[PDB]
Symmetry: C3
Subunit: 605 residues, 3 copies
């Protein structure tokens, strides 16, 4: 066969793809050990091509800097560990494990870790060892159209320098991150830990990948943005049959992933479709995470979340679970199930030190045997807020939106629900705290619409907090237990239980008071009333004026009526006058007094 060899030599020299591994002796026959051909091709300095075949390998494939490795495609070019391979190596990884490599471009092949060779139930022997593809401390890595199957640890792992993962504590940054990574159109399945994962690395885009069906039932996630990750975008990926669809977290002795964006995701039959947390920073008596911050997640799809496989000791399913994190913004979330018995606790939870979270544009459908649709619990932390808006629930949650203890600042707006198909529905909206801000509730089939600290509202509700002002373009100070309405400039209601209506330049510093229909008037005692008056002053307890001009009521329980230009000081007296006091009804002593006459037998014509 010397002629064929000569023809092949001519083809090899053409280098149509770069250099083929077969040029260096690779058989790709599913039997022969091709590791030396891969090593020789890779060290040559040429782009390396992997044609059709199953290329067996007796040890891991080490990648130097400036590597181009391209195959004929998934399930065409297949790279696979031999049955005889021992423990400790990922199938493919960059050669400099501690300080990393640069410019590595991998495309279009299957990595088959042959985990089967070890028997069933086995995961990685320690740290980041034994993934199908491990990238450690590398800059500029493009991973495209790679299928990762039968993986011992992870399918694809991006991590910092070192074989072990570092545990340096919260608020740290591990040395030698990977940086500028792109993972696109990859698939990971049959893995022991996670499908696609990042650790201690930054500037990463994960796009259009599919991670599904772990071998094991521990914390086995489709996409795991783990310890030390930051500045990562995930978009248009799918996860199926995992514990977490996308998990964003850290372990207790590590910094949480931060500044992570989910630009669309579809989670199919995961346990907790979207699961954001920081272990060790959940308890009320634990310190807040200093690292768990900034997640923006949009256009999230969750389908039939369940725990049929028994992941994580039968952890309860979730469409979304947020804990520990500050600053989580969720927009456009649809959760859907056709089986009410799969998820029966809480569809969406925001708990365990999660703070400053916002949910908007949520549709939850079919969770007709779950206790809660959305359930929020806080810690009474200063500067905290939870915002929930534009939510619709279709037979999802005995309590549709439930706010528990420790929440002082909550906004709940435009919530609607259908409860007719729910097993024993209770309330569309429930709060423990007495002062939620609420508007725009609509329901059918819930026996109670809103239950606010035990009080039911079934006919519509609008609740606002703090100093209130309406139909008034400017004013001075308004107390948080005060208001000004329908007024023009210059009004104030500066103490607890004080208010101004329909007035101009009128001020009250009177605890328990009302000024209405008045101008240039002032209340400054307590229990003061000023109505339809001009230049009126009430400056003693229970003093009041009605239809009075340029008058001052300074007596205890002293009321002035229908008067101009008088100042009164009497106790328990009603007075009237015009430039001088002209009559008195004396409640204290039972005297009636006129300046002029008192007469009976009168007529009014």
């Amino acid at each position: 066969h010397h002629f064929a060899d000569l023809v092949i030599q001519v083809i090899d020299e053409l280098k149509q793809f770069g250099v083929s591994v077969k040029t260096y002796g690779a058989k790709g026959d599913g039997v022969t050990d091709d590791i030396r051909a891969f090593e020789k091709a890779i060290e040559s300095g040429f782009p390396v091509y992997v044609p059709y075949g199953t290329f067996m390998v007796s040890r891991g494939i080490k990648l130097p800097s400036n590597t181009v490795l391209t195959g004929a495609g998934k399930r065409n070019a297949v790279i696979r560990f031999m049955d005889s391979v021992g423990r400790g190596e990922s199938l493919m990884y960059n050669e400099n494990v501690t300080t990393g490599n640069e410019n590595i471009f991998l495309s279009s092949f299957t990595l088959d870790g042959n985990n089967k060779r070890l028997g069933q139930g086995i995961s990685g022997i320690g740290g980041s060892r034994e993934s199908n593809l491990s990238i450690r401390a590398c800059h500029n890595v493009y991973i495209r159209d790679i299928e990762a199957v039968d993986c011992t640890l992870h399918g694809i792992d991006i991590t910092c320098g070192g074989l072990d993962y570092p545990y340096l504590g919260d608020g740290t940054t591990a040395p030698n991150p990977s940086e500028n990574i792109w993972i696109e159109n990859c698939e990971a399945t049959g893995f022991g830990d996670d499908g696609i994962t990042t650790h201690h690395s930054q500037y990463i885009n994960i796009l259009n990948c599919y991670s599904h069906d772990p071998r094991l039932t521990a914390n086995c996630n489709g996409f795991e943005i783990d310890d030390g990750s930051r500045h990562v975008v995930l978009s248009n990926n799918r996860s199926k049959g995992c514990y977490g669809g996308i998990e964003i977290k850290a372990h207790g002795d590590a910094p949480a992933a931060y500044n992570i964006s989910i630009n669309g995701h579809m989670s199919v039959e995961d346990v907790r479709s979207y699961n954001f947390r920081h272990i060790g920073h959940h308890a009320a008596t634990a310190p807040q995470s200093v690292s768990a911050k900034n997640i923006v997640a949009s256009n999230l799809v969750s389908i039939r979340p369940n725990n049929k496989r028994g992941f994580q000791d039968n952890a309860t399913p979730r469409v979304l679970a947020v804990s520990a994190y500050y600053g989580v913004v969720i927009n456009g979330l649809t959760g859907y199930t056709d089986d009410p018995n799969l998820l029966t606790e809480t569809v969406v939870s925001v708990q365990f030190r999660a703070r400053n979270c916002s949910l908007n544009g949520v549709v939850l459908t079919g969770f007709s045997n779950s206790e809660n649709g959305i359930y929020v619990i806080g810690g009474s932390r200063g500067g905290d807020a939870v915002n929930i808006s534009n939510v619709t629930l279709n037979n999802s949650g005995r309590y549709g939106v439930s706010i528990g203890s420790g929440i002082e600042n909550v906004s709940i707006t435009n919530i609607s629900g259908i409860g007719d198909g729910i097993n024993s529905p209770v309330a569309l909206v429930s709060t423990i705290n007495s002062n939620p801000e609420i508007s725009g509730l609509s329901s059918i089939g819930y026996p109670t619409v809103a239950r606010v600290a035990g009080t039911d509202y079934n006919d519509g509700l609008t609740l606002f907090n703090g100093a209130f002002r309406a139909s008034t373009t400017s004013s001075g100070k308004i107390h948080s237990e005060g208001f000004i309405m329908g007024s023009t400039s210059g009004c104030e209601a500066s103490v607890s239980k004080s208010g101004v209506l329909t007035s101009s330049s009128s001020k009250t510093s009177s605890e328990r008071s009302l000024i209405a229909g008045s101008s240039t008037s002032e209340a400054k005692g307590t229990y003061n009333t000023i109505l339809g008056s001009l230049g009126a002053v009430a400056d003693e307890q229970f003093a009041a004026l009605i239809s009075a001009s340029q008058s001052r009521a300074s007596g205890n329980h002293n009321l002035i009526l229908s008067s101009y230009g008088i100042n009164t000081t009497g106790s328990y007296k009603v007075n009237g006058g015009f430039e001088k006091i002209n009559w008195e009804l004396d409640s204290l002593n039972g005297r009636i007094k006129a300046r002029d006459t008192v007469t009976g037998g009168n007529t009014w014509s």
Copy 2:
């Protein structure tokens, strides 16, 4: 040419791409029938490669399970029906039409259905027959970089088992769905029905595809998520010159697509850019769709929607049309036109049993001859809501945001509009119902800003519904026609037309009543007034107290003033006193009474 043949044999055995169809006798010369070479290559068990050429085929290409078929690229590897092919077959489809196949990976070629061969104006002969690519009942199918041209039926169709589409009625699930499908970077054009479409299948991602210019003018859509579809993501696709850009629907005797996500789309010169509907479930006298639920659509672009081509009997253009569906969430929509005469009815409609829909972050520009910007019509359904927020209109709609009949629950917030360039503008916002919730309206060039059930508001408007409470951290019950403001704990306003202001522990169950500036006071008759009082009770019709302490007014039209410690029961009497009644003004009989003296000739010094 025996030498060339030997060289070729050596090349074939190298299998650089897998196996070439030319190895099995394919000519790819645009004339010779290459079907047998395709069949032999495909049955061989190797990945199949299609090099440069136009590969003619006298019958459809049947795909078995575990097929890899890769070409040299669009407009490089071209697969085409011969002129002589008859009717009934799609150009490429999976072999097991009834129960399906698995693991099919198609990349990088053109499918030319040669519809031209049949003469003009022709579509598929029946059901799912005669698309360029038909996938029926398959699991795990990746379709990438395929260009579908001159298609008889659809470009790319994903469907359940069977050549016909099943019509099993609303609320059903057809047997043998396709599942786990990825369609990426594909193009469809010159089709008879739809470019890219799904039926009775689930877990599908359609990404970065371009569907444009149908041959026909029926219901010919760019992307059609049709009968029985569910759990589909579309992202970053473009449609051009179709009827619907993305249509999400079902026919009347089928279940509507449900739980569909649009993560960005661009629609160019379609008729109805985004068109969501369920035929047969639109009429007021028809049953609600049980299947039309859950659409989350974001970052939607609509450009110059028009019906120049006369699709669907000159159906009127739309940026967005929603009907039948429950739970549609739209966020980030820009509609733009440079020709006011293309769309003259309604830019965005939410009508025909659509319910529980939300629109947020909308910009509509240039629709200066359309009657309505956004037009919503409801059905007076329980638990319904329509939420419209953060909308800006630039010369778009004589009525900017219009709410028609059957809508009881509507929130309209932060709407702004410029109407100076509009042909005869009427109102930025109009509602038929008397109780919309409205705030944050801003306009120029509209003669009326808000028209609420016939009443105009041109100077700003804030409307809220239900029980109202402001500047009060806790309270007991508030009636839906009641309020509490500026108060501390323990207050109630529990009946129609009852209210508490600036008070503590004060309760009214009095229809037509007001308590203000008071403590521990109670109104329980009707027409009751309590002002600036402590421990005051008004418990008869028209009874009242002002500046009173520890007193009870129990008479008909009985008013107490400036008093301590009295209980009165007289009809049409004003009373005052201190531990005992001390004076009376008797309106009924015209008597004035003092306990002590009545005198004239008084002075106040």
Copy 3:
């Protein structure tokens, strides 16, 4: 070597990829001029393939219509200008520079512009000349997996016909646009102007590209959507180390880009991550841009914005800067920094004639030495609005959300902030205007929560504008300085400072008035009070009625108490009666009158 030549001839005729440039004499040896082989291959009418090599070229590669040009991959197939090339040509461009070409498909190679050959600090000699890839006036162009390095002008430029850019003025459309362009998985770096840019062209998708590190420090942007662009989607791109991450703009003598969608982006260490502007249309005394309209941008990430490189004469960094544009909708924005000294002016600005902008779902973290988090300045324009909602700030901005002059319509809702780590924090929210609409503020570590036109609110605030109505399902007209609450149908409060509470069919047209607890009552003078009354009319200044039925008070300062069926007209009189006036307290003259008797010595038993 005649045998090798014969073998090669056989391989060439197989056309496995199309036609190789090596078939036409290309060496790809990094030295030999291969331009003639490229020209001959390209003119042949076959798809052209570029295998492994560095292919040197002594002049630009001209592309005709219907070109397919595919390489072996980035850093595999490399196309490069020779050192000796002069000035004036882009490395690759379509042949018909003035009226354009169609159907051009470019994939999988590096373009190396060899800008180095000119010495350092050099950019393009004029207009659109000397980019790595220039597309002028073309329809249907797909650019995929192209790496553009060492570029003289831009990496990839899409423009209209002509070598120069046209400057036709605002509101124009340049002839011969490019149309239907797709740029995907491309990289641009080491460019003189912009990485990837569009001019005077439409229907463009830019997806998953990476633009970084310009050579120069002028207006050198990652992605520049420039002069004349429209209908462009950018999604899942990354920019790093540029001036603008994504710039959307125009120069002064050109139309601004319009109707642009950003469906997710990550900006790393740019100066102004997102920078939208129209030069020449920013000044208060300049005309508004007629073209700068419609930007919808979502899921935006900004990381460590800074100006360490000194771009644009040390322009100050921004997460987001909006100017000139109408109708900008931002949803889901996270800005993050770990270095407080990089950005010290304003994190997010909306200024310089930007109008009708909305921000929602914003998290800003780490900007602890910046003066402002969000800073908005307007122009007092009619129909303008700025909407800011669901914002959380983590040690970002001495003023968290600041509203400056010229803003009449602002909505600020659900803002929370932590200020404890800020260098001298001032206020979470500050406004210059007296009438912002505000609710849902929460903070810790800011000395003031809200400062509204100089007045501080630290204990919560709810402010609404315009006519106000609550707990009332229908009403007649309400003045913008009026209100109706807790009422049933038929009420009106039609003038400044008029209000109705807890009433039915009661109307006030009385300036400075209040009706409460009443039915069928009417106030129509001024300074009118009607309380707990039925069929009561107050129609003179300071007239009032309390606990009155079927009575009319028509006197100046005339009050009726505890009465039925009387009409009074006296000045400064309190009256009561039953079908006739029965008593009077005359404040004017100091007379007390009874119809019947006046007596002392009374008891009430």
